[PDB]
């Protein structure tokens, strides 16, 4: 059990490093020098666990798309970040970092294109989204907007209508 | 209502923050999504997103359907209600709040008007003496514009008005659109 969890963590790390190549359980045992895990355990890991794990795709006799549902491409998913009107819907700071390289350099670049960062979940988590229209008047930003609205309360709007007539 | 969709895209940019703008935008497409689903889709914090949703609901940006499952959807008034209110905000501003009649006592920094000048006179000096701390008074400019600045905002309002003309036309089209 533990061995498999160590395999998964290794597999994430190896994907981060760049080695997205398809491989087999036998190859991972070898490279980690843990072939002596026993044929019974080896098989159970292979033909029960790593088939019920939705993170890997089985192709012919080998495992693909390695650590999870991913598309990889050099973490330069510019079109994906674009994604027309859908606009990604929303990217995660954690996934881009896991993807290949640290986010910060890419984010800094992304901050000067069309992307915005919000501190979602626990101020520590960050999401990226796509803005568009600029703000319309250079006021001190916030004092005029606070003064500008229609009263939260009923019949106010009706007093504005009555004043117009 | 593609025009209204864009007029709304204007309104989100001008008004609140991008989180609010994002929440309004997903809703503009006639969203009737479950709050939990709207949470997963948006990936915000549940309590805080709800705070966003309550802030938007109370000013009257949102309408609900009690499905006891809670459902949110954009209120069916088509901004104009918001814009009309905002116009009044601008319309209030536009009006001059500065009095063209104005002395003040330098010591107590109090303010006085033309109405008090006929009583704040002193004949032994031929000029004005304050009520509780007799000193000469000269002009005011207290809590008021000295030069340009309220006027610059009025000019700003003037600058806003052409770039809002097309939007007023967007409203015109929308207002004819109330046959359709
Ligand atoms: Zn005085």
UniProtKB/Swiss-Prot annotation, chain A:
Keywords annotated in UniProt: Acetylation, Disease variant, DNA-binding, Nucleus, Phosphoprotein, Transcription, Transcription regulation
Keyword hit for Nucleus: yes
Transcription keyword on record: yes
Gene Ontology molecular function terms on file: DNA binding; RNA binding; RNA polymerase II general transcription initiation factor activity
Residues annotated to bind DNA: 1-72
Domain of life: Eukaryota
Record family assignment: Belongs to the TFIIE beta subunit family.
Main function: Recruits TFIIH to the initiation complex and stimulates the RNA polymerase II C-terminal domain kinase and DNA-dependent ATPase activities of TFIIH. Both TFIIH and TFIIE are required for promoter clearance by RNA polymerase.
Subunit and partners: Tetramer of two alpha and two beta chains. Interacts with FACT subunit SUPT16H. Interacts with ATF7IP. Interacts with SND1. Part of TBP-based Pol II pre-initiation complex (PIC), in which Pol II core assembles with general transcription factors and other specific initiation factors including GTF2E1, GTF2E2, GTF2F1, GTF2F2, TCEA1, ERCC2, ERCC3, GTF2H2, GTF2H3, GTF2H4, GTF2H5, GTF2A1, GTF2A2, GTF2B and TBP; this large multi-subunit PIC complex mediates DNA unwinding and targets Pol II core to the transcription start site where the first phosphodiester bond forms.
Related illness: Trichothiodystrophy 6, non-photosensitive: A form of trichothiodystrophy, a disease characterized by sulfur-deficient brittle hair and multisystem variable abnormalities. The spectrum of clinical features varies from mild disease with only hair involvement to severe disease with cutaneous, neurologic and profound developmental defects. Ichthyosis, intellectual and developmental disabilities, decreased fertility, abnormal characteristics at birth, ocular abnormalities, short stature, and infections are common manifestations.
Protein name per UniProt: Transcription initiation factor IIE subunit beta
Organism expressing this protein natively: Homo sapiens (Human)
Phylogenetic classification of the source organism: Eukaryota, Metazoa, Chordata, Craniata, Vertebrata
Gene transcribed to yield this protein: GTF2E2
Residues included from the entire protein: 75 to 239 of 291
Curated annotation (Swiss-Prot), chain B:
UniProt domain HTH TFE/IIEalpha-type: residue ranges: 4-80
Modified residues (N6-acetyllysine): 57
Cellular location(s): Nucleus
Disulfide bonds: none
Domain of life (superkingdom): Eukaryota
Binding of Zn(2+), residues: 105, 108, 130, 133
ZnF (C4-type) residues: 105-133
Family: Belongs to the TFIIE alpha subunit family.
Subunit organization: Tetramer of two alpha and two beta chains. Interacts with TAF6/TAFII80. Interacts with ATF7IP. Interacts with SND1. Part of TBP-based Pol II pre-initiation complex (PIC), in which Pol II core assembles with general transcription factors and other specific initiation factors including GTF2E1, GTF2E2, GTF2F1, GTF2F2, TCEA1, ERCC2, ERCC3, GTF2H2, GTF2H3, GTF2H4, GTF2H5, GTF2A1, GTF2A2, GTF2B and TBP; this large multi-subunit PIC complex mediates DNA unwinding and targets Pol II core to the transcription start site where the first phosphodiester bond forms.
Function: Recruits TFIIH to the initiation complex and stimulates the RNA polymerase II C-terminal domain kinase and DNA-dependent ATPase activities of TFIIH. Both TFIIH and TFIIE are required for promoter clearance by RNA polymerase.
Protein name as it appears in the record: General transcription factor IIE subunit 1
Organism: Homo sapiens
Organism taxonomic ancestry: Eukaryota, Metazoa, Chordata, Craniata, Vertebrata
């Amino acid at each position: 059990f533990g061995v498999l969890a160590k395999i998964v963590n290794y597999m994430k790390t190896r994907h981060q490093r760049g080695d997205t190549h398809p491989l087999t359980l036998d190859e991972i045992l070898d490279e980690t020098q843990h072939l002596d895990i026993g044929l019974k355990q080896k098989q159970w890991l292979m033909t029960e666990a790593l088939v019920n794990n939705p993170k890997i795709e089985v192709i012919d006799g080998k495992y693909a798309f390695k650590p999870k549902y991913n598309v990889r491409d050099k973490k330069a998913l510019l079109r994906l970040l674009d994604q027309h009107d859908q606009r990604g819907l929303g990217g995660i700071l954690l996934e881009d970092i896991e993807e290949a390289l640290p986010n910060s350099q890419k984010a800094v670049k992304a901050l000067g294109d069309q992307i915005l960062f919000v501190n979602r979940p626990d101020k520590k988590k960050i999401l990226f989204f796509n803005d568009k229209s600029c703000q319309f008047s250079v006021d001190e930003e916030f004092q005029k907007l606070w003064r500008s609205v229609t009263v939260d309360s009923m019949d106010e709007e009706k007093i504005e209508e009555y004043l117009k007539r | 209502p593609a025009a209204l969709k864009r007029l709304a895209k204007y309104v989100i940019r001008g008004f609140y923050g991008i989180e609010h703008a994002l929440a309004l935008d997903i809703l503009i497409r006639n969203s009737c999504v479950k709050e939990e689903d709207m949470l997963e889709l948006l990936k915000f914090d549940r309590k805080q997103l709800r705070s966003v949703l309550n802030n938007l609901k109370g000013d009257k940006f949102i309408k609900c359907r009690m499905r006891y499952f809670i459902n949110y959807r954009t209120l069916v008034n088509v901004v104009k209600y918001k814009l009309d209110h905002m116009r009044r905000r601008i319309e209030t501003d536009e009006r001059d709040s500065t009095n063209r009649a104005s002395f003040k006592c330098p010591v107590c920094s109090s303010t006085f008007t033309d109405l008090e000048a006929n009583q704040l006179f002193d004949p032994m000096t031929g000029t004005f003496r304050c009520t509780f701390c007799h000193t000469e008074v000269e002009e005011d400019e207290s809590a008021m514009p000295k030069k340009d600045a309220r006027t610059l905002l009025a000019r700003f309002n003037e600058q806003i008005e052409p770039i809002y003309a097309l939007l007023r036309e967007t409203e015109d089209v929308n207002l004819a659109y109330e046959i359709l």
